[PDB]
Scaffold this active site. Sequence first.
Site, PDB file in Angstrom:
ATOM      1  N   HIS A  20     -23.113  22.048  51.179  1.00 34.80           N
ATOM      2  CA  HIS A  20     -21.962  22.878  51.498  1.00 34.80           C
ATOM      3  C   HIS A  20     -21.804  23.950  50.417  1.00 34.80           C
ATOM      4  CE1 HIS A  20     -17.493  23.653  51.943  1.00 34.80           C
ATOM      5  NE2 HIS A  20     -17.902  23.771  53.194  1.00 34.80           N
ATOM      6  N   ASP A  46     -18.497  24.819  57.220  1.00 33.73           N
ATOM      7  CA  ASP A  46     -17.570  23.711  57.361  1.00 33.73           C
ATOM      8  C   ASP A  46     -18.000  22.752  58.462  1.00 33.73           C
ATOM      9  OD1 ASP A  46     -16.234  25.012  55.358  1.00 33.73           O
ATOM     10  OD2 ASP A  46     -14.722  25.918  56.660  1.00 33.73           O
TER      11      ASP A  46
END
Length: 123
Positions: free
Chosen positions: A46, A91
Site C-alpha cells: 500500500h 485502498d
Amino acid sequence: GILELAGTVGCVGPRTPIAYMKYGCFCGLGGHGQPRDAIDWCCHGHDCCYTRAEEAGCSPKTERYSWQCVNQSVLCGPAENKCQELLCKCDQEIANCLAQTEYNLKYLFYPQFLCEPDSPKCD
Ligand SMILES: [Ca+2]
C-alpha cells in the site's frame, strides 16, 4: 483519503480498520524494515502504491473519492479525475489483501526500533 481507506478496509472485513492503525513495520505513517507477516506485507504494498500516486501528482492521504460497498466488495467510482482512480485502486487493493490474513497480536504497536533500516523493493 483516510476516510475512504478506513471505509474500504471496513467494507471487506473481517476486523476493525483500527486494528491496522499501527502494526508491524509498515502499517502506520511511514515504515521501514522487513515485513513481519502477511498484514505487514499488505501495508508495504500500500505504501508503495501511495508513493506511485504521489509521483503521479496526487494526494493519497487527503483527496476524497466515491465508491460502493457491495457484499463486502469495493467498487470504485465514479471518478472525477485520474487521481481518484489511483487512490481507490490502492485502498481497494490493501482492503482485499488485508481481508485474506490472520491477525498476530504480537505485532500490534511493534516498536519501529526493532525494524530494519532497509526495505524490500516496490513492485
Ligand atoms: Ca505505512
